């Protein structure tokens, strides 16, 4: 995007929860253009989280995404020869993309056999503050406050 702002794609509301964040999550699950399979994964995982826990999967999905949102991250900047890992904030749009992608890439690193089991288990742990996804978030904010000595390079 050299010319324009390259506006955001507006996702269609969830067919079930009427929620755009659901569809955006379903999309990150979808591979090879199978949205049908990706939904049946997500929705059959909504039954796992709502049976194995007496709580609404809507509020858990939200609560899990929130706990994985990084407030800061590290970027490179070419300065005086070799570059530097520079900490800076995260626009709230990027907090969305990272936390969502992190949930999904974590769940496939899980031991569980079937797809929806990994999702619901990762989600359940992520809202609780544990599980692989929250570690990527807690490790990123560790890059910042480590290279905090370069907070003057903000760019």
């Amino acid at each position: 995007a050299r010319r324009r702002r390259a506006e955001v794609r507006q996702l269609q509301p969830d067919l079930v929860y009427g929620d755009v964040l659901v569809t955006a999550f379903i999309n990150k699950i979808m591979r090879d253009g199978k949205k049908n399979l990706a939904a049946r994964i997500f929705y059959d995982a909504c039954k796992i989280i709502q049976e194995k826990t007496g709580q609404e999967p809507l509020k858990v999905f939200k609560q899990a995404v929130e706990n994985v949102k990084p407030r800061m991250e590290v970027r490179s900047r070419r300065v005086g020869g070799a570059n530097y890992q520079v900490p800076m904030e995260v626009s709230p749009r990027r907090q969305q993309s990272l936390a969502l992608r992190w949930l999904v890439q974590a769940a496939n690193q899980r031991p569980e056999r079937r797809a929806a089991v990994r999702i619901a288990h990762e989600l359940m742990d992520a809202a609780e503050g544990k599980g692989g996804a929250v570690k990527k978030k807690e490790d990123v904010e560790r890059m910042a406050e480590a290279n905090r000595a370069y907070a003057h390079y903000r760019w």
């Binding site: 905090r148 000595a149 370069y150 907070a151 003057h152």
Partner: protein, 116 residues
């Protein structure tokens, strides 16, 4: 062990380091910190962060002898010359005044080729 509770704070800010000394009203020092006193070793000491943590390290060292009132004195241009001041104000030490006393010669001594 002294109970001074009022005195001076000198910020020596160069491009390679920022270092902070705290004295009593007569000028004799009490405690001090620097970019190297805190863990930083190389070029990192002349950063605004190191400038901040150094100013605050000495500012807590002065709380031991009971410092409250602080008169700030500044020498040198440097990264984090201002950042050490801004740190010093928020240190809890009530900052009495700020003075820039950076020594300038009246063109007396031949500088190194680096400054020529």
């Amino acid at each position: 062990k002294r109970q001074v509770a009022s005195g001076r704070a000198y910020i020596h800010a160069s491009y390679n380091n920022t270092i902070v000394t705290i004295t009593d009203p007569d000028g004799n020092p009490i405690t001090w910190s620097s970019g190297g006193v805190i863990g930083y070793k190389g070029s990192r000491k002349g950063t605004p962060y190191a400038a901040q943590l150094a100013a605050l390290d000495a500012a807590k060292k002065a709380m031991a002898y009971g410092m409250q009132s602080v008169d700030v004195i500044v020498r040198g241009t440097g990264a984090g010359r201002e950042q050490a001041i801004r740190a010093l104000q928020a240190s809890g030490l009530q900052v009495k005044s700020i003075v820039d006393d950076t020594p300038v010669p009246h063109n007396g001594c031949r500088p190194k080729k680096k400054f020529r």
